[PDB]
């Protein structure tokens, strides 16, 4: 664990949500039909929190609320993983996700996180100090001019941790792209805060040009349009403005 | 009983040697087990590989001694160990461990032989 | 038995048909669940406890049972859920010199709590004068060594006992059993039931290409018309069998 | 599978003093463990098999304590002739093991 004092204090940047925050609600199949569903969805044209990393070092701990929408304008895969928990120490069991150079690491355990977790050719992992009572582990295939857009939606309902992902090549651009459900985790711990994980190049340490966005889910009603293939193409918010309500 | 060793001498690197453990006063019975160990001149003991003296030899090997070494029983009172591609770090003092229980592996060793020294030079 | 090993089993499918060659002459008498329907059952928690006890002491492994093994070596809770397996091991745990390597706790201050292990080697004081490290009269070693006697009956022979403890939540399940499969039949009126989804219809080949995460298929009437087979990843059309009014 | 460590590496107590050597295993080995002591230029001999039972021809001072993962050997007294190295063997599961024997621990008796 290494303490970082090179942080530049600055109020967070902000940007519009536009038309992002859509995922397939279920595993059922509908084609060329319109269905309305009530679920935790990201409100359209909301203002999300923007962090810029470059000497900008933005690694705060944000509240989880009822859900989180994660997007990041990426190149060279600066963002590595996420840390989830409530107390962020060994007192309460926490959660860890890291996509190293080989695979993805899934571990739920009473970790003891470093004060400034980060990563450092990358062969230096300093993000935690200990793990006391481990419950579940998993290893799978690795998840991965600005040319990479990655959208992530994390939810925690009924002790299940749902993750939705989408990889896109390209502030937030305008468009539409639904998010498929990636993996479900039957963990059953309550999450109130989190913090992302980054990789730092050592030459001091140099951070590349990248940014990430954080959105918050809310209980709304959406109307979604399925194409003839079977995928979502357009959606309409049902509580944004009176025209959309009609 | 004695388990005096044999076949120990200076050997060139990348070569083969034949170490023979000969029992005296008893034969290799099936109900009791035998094993092979060696001791480096500077550090502690280690286990490489050995086979049981029963009707069905339950041969067992160590992780770092997976395929380089070869042990077989030639008579009721004579067992030999064969190693190939010998390296500089293979020099040690070899002992012929005598086990007390046939649980398919090295159990408590009550008796050892005097042992032999095998060294490498060029 | 005094230092009984404890093992965790999870994130796997439990196959109980193997436990006939590995453990012949086994007794599957157990509590808390029907032994037969364990194949199609899901366990969220599994504990494994294995040790060796004498033949006369195998009956002591039961909830609410008192005895030498129960009070001082391994105590079972009254509300014990899970099953125990015991089989003879005379061919394996019997020596011509003697099986002197297995020890059990004989003297102990108080009866052990359920699912507890005691590895203490302190000299037991059964009198008034303190032992002070002396193992003389009124001062006996708490652990005695089994002396298995294969010449006598099975009660004086080494018995290998494996104790399995579950919880049976069958909702956050991590251990389950193979649900098997059925010879798919196509192009006829069929009573189907896929993962609890019971229905009647004609199962035909489906041209739809719904996504890997995507499992079912719904229609305008909000009824399941397309399904993907759990046994084999294939797309099927569920069509209600031909019908109509007669006049 | 099972990795065993022996600590401390070096110990030194007076002739009337007491020294203890503990043997730790990566996972539980129950009752299966043995203690071996070798003098320089001499193969080791079994001292404490089954971690509690004393061997034959050995002084009672040699003993054993602990079970499962941690095993401790307590020396009640030395007489300037027991200064040697002590090893512990796993003798529990040797299917694929680099070395059943534990680490080296020599004893120095300052007479
Ligand atoms: C976020 O955007 C809204 C407009 O949708 C604006 O009113 C608000 O001031 C913005 N937030 C900040 C911190 O400026
Ligand atoms: C959910 O987790 C939080 C952690 O802060 C805890 O306070 C709360 O009691 C938990 N709820 C339940 C139902 O366990
Ligand atoms: C999917 O829809 C597109 C039009 O959006 C169409 O061109 C394509 O042929 C469809 N897929 C298949 C397999 O026909």
Author numbering:
A (entry chain B): 15 to 68, 77 to 142, 153 to 176, 185 to 210, 215 to 247, 257 to 299
B (entry chain I): 1 to 122
C (entry chain C): 350 to 596
D (entry chain H): 1 to 111
Quote from the publication.
As the major determinant of the host specificity, the SARS-CoV-2 spike glycoprotein contains S1 and S2 subunits responsible for receptor recognition and membrane fusion, similar to other coronaviruses such as SARS-CoV and the Middle East Respiratory Syndrome Coronavirus (MERS-CoV). The RBD can adopt two different conformations: the “up” conformation, which is receptor-accessible, and the “down” conformation, which is shielded from receptor binding. Here we characterize a rabbit monoclonal antibody (RmAb) 1H1 with broad-spectrum neutralizing potency against Omicron sublineages including BA.1, BA.1.1, BA.2, BA.2.12.1, BA.2.75, BA.3 and BA.4/5. Cryo-electron microscopy (cryo-EM) structure determination of the BA.1 spike-1H1 Fab complexes shows that 1H1 targets a highly conserved region of RBD and avoids most of the circulating Omicron mutations, explaining its broad-spectrum neutralization potency.
To confirm the accuracy of the 3-Fab-per-trimer binding mode of 1H1 to the BA.1 spike protein, we also carried out cryo-EM experiments using the entire IgG of 1H1. The 3D reconstruction displayed a binding mode in which three 1H1 Fab fragments (from three 1H1 IgG molecules) were bound to the BA.1 spike protein. We refined it to an overall resolution of 3.68 Å. The BA.1 spike protein contains two RBDs in the “up” conformation and one in the “semi-up” conformation, which is consistent with the 1H1 Fab-BA.1 spike complex in the class II conformation.
